[PDB]
């Protein structure tokens, strides 16, 4: 296993996003790329992390090995890398240690980091065939702002899909809080563009603690691809440009 990554800040932001919600995760390393369907420390939210081999520089893998690592210790090791450090993963065939080489951008400061591993394995749950009813491609800084706003009111956000826009209704001890979005006139690609598709009406109640954990993937991708239906869990998707996606699943309340 040798997975070189020139944009190692992508992997650092993945570990910053996943350090507060999953403590111990299995890393289903396939030949197609880095894959993860781990689940949180509670029994509420599912995380489907996919890092394909196209965005990696040189990806080599021989067998479908699953590494149960500690995501807090791995995030503390990913904090040792810089924001422009080239990160080369390395796993031995027999030794259960994950070697991380944070090469410098000028290739001066070579930073070899060997990580101990545990042996925690969990059952695998895949994508249960979502119809993708309401797909809200909206900016991730705005979704982080919306969840950080409505976490200060209560633990219940009410999201309603419509043609003219999307609502974010929250109520609690402080009072009523609604946040309404709209479309965008000019065709802009990533930022300031809330694009919503519409098949059937939906109105669901979500927790703000797990959504506040979900909004820590804001520096990964600029666009949150929300996806939900009636009695279908909310898919907060974090499609990275060079490889894969980070899917956050949340059952309604």
Partner 1 sequence: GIQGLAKLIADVAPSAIRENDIKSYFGRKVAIDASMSIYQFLIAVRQGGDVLQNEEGETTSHLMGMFYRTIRMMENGIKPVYVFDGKPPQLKSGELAKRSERRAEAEKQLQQAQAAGAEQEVEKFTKRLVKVTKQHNDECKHLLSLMGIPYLDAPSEAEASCAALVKAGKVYAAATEDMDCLTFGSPVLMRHLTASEAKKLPIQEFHLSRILQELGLNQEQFVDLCILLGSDYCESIRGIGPKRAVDLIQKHKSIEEIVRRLDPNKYPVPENWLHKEAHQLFLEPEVLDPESVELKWSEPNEEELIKFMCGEKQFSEERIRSGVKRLSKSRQGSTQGRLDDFFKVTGSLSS
Residue 129's nearest CA partner among 25, 28, 229, 236 is 229
Question: Which residues within the stretch 127-186 sit at the binding site for partner 1 (CB under 8 A)?
Answer: 127, 155-156
State the virtual CA torsion across 125, 205, 240, 111 in degrees, nearest 10.
-80
Among 120, 162, 179, 193, binds partner 1 (CB under 8 A): 120
CB of 19 to a second copy, least distance (A): 13
Closer residue to a second copy (CB): 177 or 219: 177
What HEC string does 122-160 produce?
CCCCCCCCCCCCEEEEEEHHHHHHHHHHHCCCCCCEEEE
First to last CA, the chain: 41
Residue 97's nearest CA partner among 50, 65, 57, 59 is 65
CB of 110 to a second copy, least distance (A): 4
Could you give phi then psi for residue 151, rounded to 5 degrees? -75, -20
Closer residue to DNA (CB): 141 or 165: 141
Among 41, 178, 184, 203, binds partner 1 (CB under 8 A): 41
User: How far is residue 56 from each of residues 34, 131, 196, measured CA to CA in Å?
Assistant: 10, 30, 31
Closer residue to partner 1 (CB): 3 or 235: 235
Among 13, 14, 18, 45, binds partner 1 (CB under 8 A): 45
Rg (CA), the chain: 19
CB of 185 to DNA, least distance (A): 23
124 binds partner 1 (CB under 8 A): yes
What HEC string does 184-207 produce?
CCCCCCCCCCCEECCCCCCEEEEC
Where does this chain touch a second copy (CB under 8 A) — which range of 21-29, 68-76, 119-127, 226-234? 68-76
Closer residue to DNA (CB): 79 or 253: 79
15 binds partner 1 (CB under 8 A): no
Question: Total residues at the site for partner 1 (CB under 8 A)?
Answer: 35
Per CB under 8 A, residues contacting a second copy are 70, 73, 76-77, 79-80, 82, 97-98, 106-116, 142, 145, 149-150, 152-153, 165, 173-184, 190, 192, 194
């Amino acid at each position: 296993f040798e997975a070189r990554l020139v944009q190692g800040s992508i992997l650092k932001k993945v570990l910053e996003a996943l350090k507060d919600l999953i403590n111990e995760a299995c890393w289903d390393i396939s030949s197609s790329g880095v894959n993860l369907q781990s689940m949180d420390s509670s029994h509420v939210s599912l995380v489907q992390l996919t890092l394909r081999s196209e965005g990696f520089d040189t990806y080599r893998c021989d067998r479908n090995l699953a590494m149960g690592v500690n995501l807090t210790s791995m995030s503390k090791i990913l904090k040792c890398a810089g924001n422009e450090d080239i990160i080369t993963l390395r796993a031995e065939d027999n030794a259960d240690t994950l070697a991380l080489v944070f090469e410098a951008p000028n290739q001066e400061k070579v930073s070899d980091y060997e990580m101990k591993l545990m042996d925690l394995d969990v059952e695998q749950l895949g994508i249960p065939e979502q119809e993708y009813s309401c797909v809200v491609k909206m900016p991730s800084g705005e979704f982080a702002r919306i969840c950080r706003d409505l976490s200060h009111i209560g633990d219940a956000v009410v999201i309603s899909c419509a043609k003219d826009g999307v609502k974010f209704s929250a109520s609690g001890e402080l009072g009523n809080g609604n946040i309404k979005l709209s479309q965008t006139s000019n065709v802009d690609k990533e930022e300031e563009a809330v694009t919503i598709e519409m098949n059937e009406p939906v109105q669901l109640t979500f927790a703000l603690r797990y959504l506040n954990f979900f909004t820590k993937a804001t520096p990964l991708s600029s666009t949150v691809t929300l996806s939900m239906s009636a009695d279908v869990p909310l898919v907060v998707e974090y499609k990275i440009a060079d490889m894969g996606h980070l899917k956050y699943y949340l059952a309604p309340k």
